[PDB]
């Protein structure tokens, strides 16, 4: 059912996941926090924002690893087990 389109959708999903992971890692790298915008609780809000940035970086890394493994499995299926047009092993 749209094998070429299915592989294209899988590749697009993998590319989007990798781009999102890279963007989130770059955003977490920019965690200077030189603006004291928190007027209710400056230290508490700053610590919460630091923890949130760390958790977002960890979640981006986990999502990237999961997408990498899933795309690897999907390519292994769609290529090796699906279209092994090099059936010379059969003749061998």
């Amino acid at each position: 059912q749209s094998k070429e389109t299915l592989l294209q959708s899988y590749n697009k999903r993998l590319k989007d996941d990798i781009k999102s992971i890279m963007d989130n890692f770059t955003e977490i790298i920019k965690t200077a926090k030189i603006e004291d915008e928190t007027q209710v609780s400056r230290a508490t809000q700053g610590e919460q924002d630091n923890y949130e940035m760390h958790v977002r970086a960890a979640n981006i890394v986990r999502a990237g690893e999961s997408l990498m493994k899933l795309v690897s499995d999907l390519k292994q299926f769609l290529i090796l087990n699906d279209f092994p047009s090099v059936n010379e092993a059969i003749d061998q």
């Binding site: 977490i28 965690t31 928190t38 400056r42 700053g46 923890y51 760390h54 960890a58 890394v61």
Partner: peptide, 22 residues
């Protein structure tokens, strides 16, 4: 947290958490 006192510890903890995840 532009305090330059607790922001250091916050960045250290964030780096430690990122290193643990990696």
């Amino acid at each position: 947290s532009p305090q330059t006192l607790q922001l250091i510890s916050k960045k250290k903890s964030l780096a430690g958490a990122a290193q643990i995840l990696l």
